[PDB]
Amino acid sequence: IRLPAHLRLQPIYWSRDDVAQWLKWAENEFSLSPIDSNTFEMNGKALLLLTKEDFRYRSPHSGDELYELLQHILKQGP
């Protein structure tokens, strides 16, 4: 993945602006339906506490994909 540099940190340290940039990157990188940043106005800590369901309610169309992408990020190697 061509993850942005500042996002190479462990997601537990991502800021709220960092998560804003994360949604921008994914939508562009994976051609996802638009995502409002206001939808996911949170830090990395709070974002990691979300369920794929929660992502979907917040983003009905590209929500679950973001969840799984986040899991890939977290899962460096199987």
User: Which conformational region is residue 47 in: left (phi greater than 0), alpha (psi within -120 to 50 degrees), or beta?
Assistant: alpha
- Residue with smaller CB distance to Cl ion, 14 or 55: 14
- Token duo for residue 38: 């206001």
Residue 16 or 56: the one with the smaller Cβ distance to Cl ion is: 16
- Min CB(16)–Cl ion separation in Å: 4
Name the minimum Å distance from CB 9 to Cl ion: 13
Q: Are 14 and 47 in contact (CB under 8 A)?
A: yes
Residues in contact with Cl ion by the rule CB under 5 A: 15-16, 43
Residue nearest Cl ion, CB atom distance: 16
Compute how many other C-beta atoms are within 10 angstroms of the C-beta atom of residue 36: 10
User: For Cl ion, which is the closer residue by CB, 20 or 32?
Assistant: 20
